[PDB]
């Protein structure tokens, strides 16, 4: 049954995350952080396209998870412990004889949070981040940061600096009117690649392409 998650996974602050399997042999794993409104047709379409490229997809409803993040004390949320633990728990439940480091991805606020997490990732933990149409993340606290600095905007929302050295690859894909840089030099410098495409369909296709590529490069 392609419409029913094979298992659900719970670990640390992530609760009851569905695990969807593709029809072919898996070639990667993606954790898909929704926008704050939840899993809508953009997230569903993105999941379907990743599943069609044989990526295991774990869609995360942003709302309940962001509520847990906001309840922490301290100055920032450390994100990657959730992602490492939920991926390990999902792979132990699947029992496929394969392990993948997850690609972190998302749309809107989830896309921004995926980038922030990648920017503060230990080595050998994630395959990279793909941020589809990122918008400022309205978390109470900033994500903890290495070099991608948290910027608290005039509405209180968080964005995270680019042109900042990253411990894992990251690509941000945005609508027209957003900057585009030189992907070859960005990757050589370990900074965010910045790209655009004129409609959501083309931007989503680019996102899937790079989820697959990051997963393949990490395995």
| Rounded CA separation 217/108 (Å) | 25
CA distances from 180 to 81, 137, 171, 175, 195 (A): 31, 21, 11, 11, 5
Kindly state the tokens that stand for 112. Answer: 């921004």
What whole-number distance in Å separates Cα of residue 14 and Cα of residue 16? 7
Resolution of the coordinates, Å: 1.7
d(CA 89, CA 91): 6
Indicate the burial class of 67 (C-beta count within 10 angstroms; 0-12, 13-18, 19 or more): exposed
Domain 7-218 top-level CATH class = alpha beta
* Contact assessment for residue 185 and residue 191, using Cβ atoms and an 8 Å cutoff: no
Residue with tokens 């990757």: 187
Please give the Cα distance from 115 to 83 (Å, whole number). 13
Under 8 Å between Cβ of 127 and 101: yes
From residue 142, alpha-carbon distances to 31, 111, 153, 166, 177 in Å are: 20, 14, 11, 17, 26
Q: Are 88 and 66 contacting, i.e. CB atoms less than 8 angstroms apart?
A: no
Expressed in angstroms, the distance from the first to the final Cα of the chain is: 27
Q: Is 17 helix (H, G, I), strand (E, B) or coil?
A: strand
How far apart (Å, rounded) are the C-alpha atoms in residues 88 and 12?
12
Name 84's Cβ contacts closer than 8 Å, sequence gap at least 6: 102, 125, 126
Across 80-176, where does the E strand assignment appear? 103-108, 128-134, 150-152, 158-160, 170-174
């Amino acid at each position: 049954d392609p419409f029913t998650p094979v298992i659900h996974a719970s670990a640390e602050r992530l609760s009851n995350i569905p695990v969807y399997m593709p029809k072919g042999d898996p070639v990667g794993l993606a954790i898909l952080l929704s926008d704050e409104k939840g899993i809508g047709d953009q997230e569903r379409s993105y999941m379907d396209a990743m599943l069609a490229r044989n990526i295991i997809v774990m869609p995360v409803e942003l709302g309940p998870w962001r509520a847990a993040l906001d309840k922490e004390d301290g100055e920032c949320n450390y994100l990657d412990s959730d992602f490492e633990a939920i991926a390990k728990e999902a792979l132990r439940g699947l029992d496929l004889g394969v392990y993948f480091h997850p690609v972190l991805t998302g749309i809107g606020q989830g896309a921004t949070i995926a980038y922030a997490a990648a920017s503060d990732s230990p080595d050998a933990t994630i395959a990279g981040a793909v941020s589809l149409d990122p918008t400022p993340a309205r978390t109470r606290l900033p994500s903890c940061t290495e070099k991608a600095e948290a910027i608290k905007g005039p509405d209180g929302g968080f964005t995270y600096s680019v042109n900042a050295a990253l411990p894992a690859p990251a690509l941000l894909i945005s609508p027209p009117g957003s900057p585009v840089n030189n992907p070859v030099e960005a990757r050589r410098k370990n900074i965010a690649v910045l790209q655009t495409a004129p409609d959501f369909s083309a931007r989503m296709k680019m996102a899937v392409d790079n989820v697959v590529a990051m997963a393949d490069q990490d395995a």
